Coordinates of all heavy atoms in Angstrom, one line a residue:
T1 N 20.8 -5.8 -4.2 CA 20.5 -4.5 -3.5 C 19.2 -3.9 -4.1 O 18.2 -3.6 -3.4 CB 21.6 -3.6 -3.5 OG1 22.8 -4.2 -2.9 CG2 21.2 -2.3 -2.8
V2 N 19.2 -3.7 -5.4 CA 18.1 -3.0 -6.0 C 16.8 -3.7 -5.8 O 15.9 -3.2 -5.3 CB 18.3 -2.9 -7.6 CG1 17.1 -2.2 -8.2 CG2 19.6 -2.1 -7.8
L3 N 16.8 -5.1 -6.0 CA 15.7 -5.9 -5.8 C 15.2 -5.8 -4.4 O 13.9 -5.7 -4.0 CB 15.9 -7.4 -6.1 CG 16.0 -7.5 -7.7 CD1 15.8 -9.0 -8.0 CD2 15.0 -6.6 -8.4
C4 N 16.1 -5.7 -3.4 CA 15.5 -5.5 -2.0 C 14.8 -4.3 -1.9 O 13.6 -4.4 -1.3 CB 16.9 -5.6 -1.1 SG 17.8 -7.0 -0.9
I5 N 15.3 -3.1 -2.3 CA 14.5 -1.9 -2.2 C 13.2 -2.2 -3.0 O 12.1 -1.7 -2.6 CB 15.3 -0.7 -2.7 CG1 16.6 -0.6 -1.8 CG2 14.5 0.5 -2.7 CD1 16.2 -0.5 -0.3
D6 N 13.3 -2.8 -4.1 CA 12.1 -3.0 -5.0 C 11.0 -3.7 -4.2 O 9.9 -3.3 -4.4 CB 12.5 -3.8 -6.2 CG 11.3 -4.2 -7.1 OD1 10.6 -3.2 -7.6 OD2 11.2 -5.4 -7.3
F7 N 11.3 -4.7 -3.4 CA 10.4 -5.3 -2.6 C 9.6 -4.4 -1.8 O 8.3 -4.4 -1.8 CB 11.0 -6.5 -1.8 CG 10.0 -7.3 -0.9 CD1 9.5 -8.5 -1.5 CD2 9.6 -6.8 0.3 CE1 8.6 -9.2 -0.8 CE2 8.6 -7.7 1.0 CZ 8.2 -8.9 0.4
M8 N 10.2 -3.4 -1.2 CA 9.4 -2.5 -0.4 C 8.4 -1.6 -1.2 O 7.3 -1.5 -0.9 CB 10.5 -1.4 0.3 CG 11.7 -2.1 1.1 SD 12.7 -1.0 1.9 CE 11.6 -0.2 3.1
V9 N 9.0 -1.2 -2.4 CA 8.0 -0.5 -3.4 C 6.8 -1.3 -3.6 O 5.8 -0.7 -4.0 CB 8.8 0.0 -4.5 CG1 8.2 1.1 -5.3 CG2 10.2 0.6 -4.1
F10 N 6.9 -2.6 -3.8 CA 5.8 -3.5 -4.0 C 4.9 -3.5 -2.9 O 3.7 -3.3 -3.0 CB 6.2 -4.8 -4.5 CG 6.5 -5.0 -6.0 CD1 7.7 -4.9 -6.4 CD2 5.5 -5.1 -6.8 CE1 8.1 -5.0 -7.7 CE2 5.7 -5.2 -8.2 CZ 7.0 -5.1 -8.7
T11 N 5.5 -3.7 -1.6 CA 4.6 -3.9 -0.5 C 3.8 -2.6 -0.1 O 2.7 -2.8 0.3 CB 5.5 -4.4 0.7 OG1 6.3 -5.5 0.3 CG2 4.6 -4.8 2.0
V12 N 4.4 -1.5 -0.3 CA 3.7 -0.3 0.0 C 2.6 0.0 -0.9 O 1.8 1.0 -0.7 CB 4.6 0.9 0.2 CG1 5.6 0.7 1.2 CG2 5.2 1.2 -1.3
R13 N 2.4 -0.8 -2.0 CA 1.3 -0.7 -3.0 C 0.1 -1.5 -2.4 O -1.0 -1.1 -2.8 CB 1.7 -1.2 -4.4 CG 2.9 -0.4 -5.0 CD 2.7 -0.7 -6.5 NE 2.6 -1.9 -6.9 CZ 1.5 -2.4 -7.6 NH1 0.4 -1.8 -7.7 NH2 1.6 -3.6 -7.9
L14 N 0.2 -2.3 -1.3 CA -1.0 -2.9 -0.8 C -1.9 -1.8 -0.2 O -3.2 -2.0 -0.3 CB -0.6 -3.7 0.4 CG 0.0 -5.1 0.2 CD1 0.5 -5.8 1.4 CD2 -1.1 -6.0 -0.5
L15 N -1.5 -0.6 0.3 CA -2.3 0.4 0.8 C -3.1 0.9 -0.5 O -4.3 1.0 -0.3 CB -1.6 1.5 1.4 CG -0.5 1.2 2.3 CD1 0.4 2.4 2.7 CD2 -1.1 0.6 3.7
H16 N -2.5 1.1 -1.6 CA -3.2 1.5 -2.9 C -4.3 0.6 -3.2 O -5.4 0.9 -3.7 CB -2.1 1.7 -3.9 CG -2.8 2.3 -5.2 ND1 -3.6 3.5 -5.1 CD2 -2.8 2.0 -6.5 CE1 -4.0 3.8 -6.3 NE2 -3.5 3.0 -7.2
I17 N -4.1 -0.8 -2.9 CA -5.0 -1.8 -3.1 C -6.3 -1.6 -2.3 O -7.4 -1.8 -2.6 CB -4.4 -3.2 -3.1 CG1 -3.3 -3.3 -4.1 CG2 -5.5 -4.3 -3.3 CD1 -2.7 -4.6 -4.1
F18 N -6.0 -1.2 -1.0 CA -7.1 -1.1 0.0 C -7.7 0.1 0.1 O -8.5 0.2 1.1 CB -6.5 -1.8 1.3 CG -6.3 -3.2 1.5 CD1 -5.3 -3.9 1.0 CD2 -7.3 -4.0 2.1 CE1 -5.2 -5.3 1.0 CE2 -7.2 -5.3 2.2 CZ -6.2 -5.9 1.7
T19 N -7.4 1.1 -0.6 CA -8.2 2.3 -0.7 C -9.6 2.1 -1.1 O -10.5 2.9 -0.6 CB -7.5 3.4 -1.7 OG1 -7.5 2.7 -3.0 CG2 -6.2 3.6 -1.2
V20 N -10.0 1.0 -1.7 CA -11.5 0.7 -2.0 C -12.1 0.2 -0.8 O -13.3 0.4 -0.7 CB -11.4 -0.5 -3.1 CG1 -12.8 -0.6 -3.6 CG2 -10.5 -0.1 -4.2
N21 N -11.5 -0.3 0.1 CA -12.1 -0.9 1.4 C -12.8 0.3 2.2 O -12.3 1.4 2.2 CB -11.1 -1.6 2.2 CG -11.7 -2.4 3.4 OD1 -12.2 -1.9 4.4 ND2 -11.8 -3.7 3.1
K22 N -13.9 0.0 2.7 CA -14.9 1.1 3.3 C -14.3 1.4 4.8 O -14.8 2.5 5.3 CB -16.2 0.5 3.5 CG -16.9 0.3 2.1 CD -18.5 0.0 2.3 CE -19.0 1.1 3.1 NZ -20.5 0.9 3.3
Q23 N -13.4 0.7 5.3 CA -12.7 1.1 6.5 C -11.3 1.7 6.6 O -11.1 2.6 7.3 CB -12.8 -0.2 7.5 CG -14.3 -0.7 7.6 CD -14.3 -1.9 8.5 OE1 -13.3 -2.4 9.1 NE2 -15.5 -2.4 9.0
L24 N -10.5 1.0 5.8 CA -9.1 1.5 5.7 C -9.0 2.7 4.9 O -8.2 3.6 5.2 CB -8.1 0.3 5.2 CG -8.2 -0.9 6.0 CD1 -7.4 -2.0 5.3 CD2 -7.6 -0.7 7.4
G25 N -9.7 2.8 3.8 CA -9.5 3.9 2.8 C -9.8 5.3 3.4 O -8.9 6.1 3.0
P26 N -10.7 5.5 4.1 CA -11.0 6.9 4.7 C -9.8 7.3 5.6 O -9.6 8.5 5.9 CB -12.3 6.8 5.5 CG -13.0 5.7 4.8 CD -12.0 4.7 4.3
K27 N -9.1 6.4 6.2 CA -7.9 6.6 7.0 C -6.6 6.8 6.0 O -5.8 7.6 6.5 CB -7.7 5.6 8.0 CG -8.8 5.4 9.0 CD -9.1 6.6 9.8 CE -10.2 6.3 10.9 NZ -9.7 5.1 11.7
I28 N -6.5 6.0 5.1 CA -5.4 6.1 4.1 C -5.4 7.4 3.5 O -4.3 8.0 3.1 CB -5.5 4.9 3.1 CG1 -5.3 3.6 3.9 CG2 -4.3 5.0 2.1 CD1 -5.5 2.4 3.0
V29 N -6.4 8.0 3.2 CA -6.7 9.2 2.6 C -6.2 10.4 3.5 O -5.8 11.6 3.1 CB -7.9 9.6 1.8 CG1 -8.2 8.4 0.8 CG2 -9.1 9.5 2.9
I30 N -6.4 10.1 4.8 CA -6.0 11.2 5.8 C -4.6 11.1 6.0 O -3.9 12.0 6.4 CB -6.9 11.0 7.2 CG1 -8.3 11.1 6.8 CG2 -6.5 12.1 8.2 CD1 -9.2 11.0 8.1
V31 N -4.0 9.9 5.9 CA -2.4 9.8 6.2 C -1.7 10.8 5.2 O -0.7 11.3 5.8 CB -2.0 8.3 6.0 CG1 -0.6 8.2 6.0 CG2 -2.6 7.5 7.2

């Protein structure tokens, strides 16, 4: 059970990875 939830916490870090991108980042900061 814990690991299942853990997977989500990893996947939602992809956004944090893509803040550098010149197109997604300006929208991720508005979200």
Side-chain angles (χ1 to χ4, degrees):
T1 301
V2 180
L3 289 196
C4 294
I5 301 305
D6 176 58
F7 185 90
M8 310 183 66
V9 194
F10 276 96
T11 307
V12 301
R13 298 205 309 111
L14 279 174
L15 311 172
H16 187 52
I17 298 181
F18 279 82
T19 56
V20 192
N21 195 278
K22 295 190 59 181
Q23 301 180 353
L24 300 174
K27 304 292 187 56
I28 299 176
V29 300
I30 302 181
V31 167

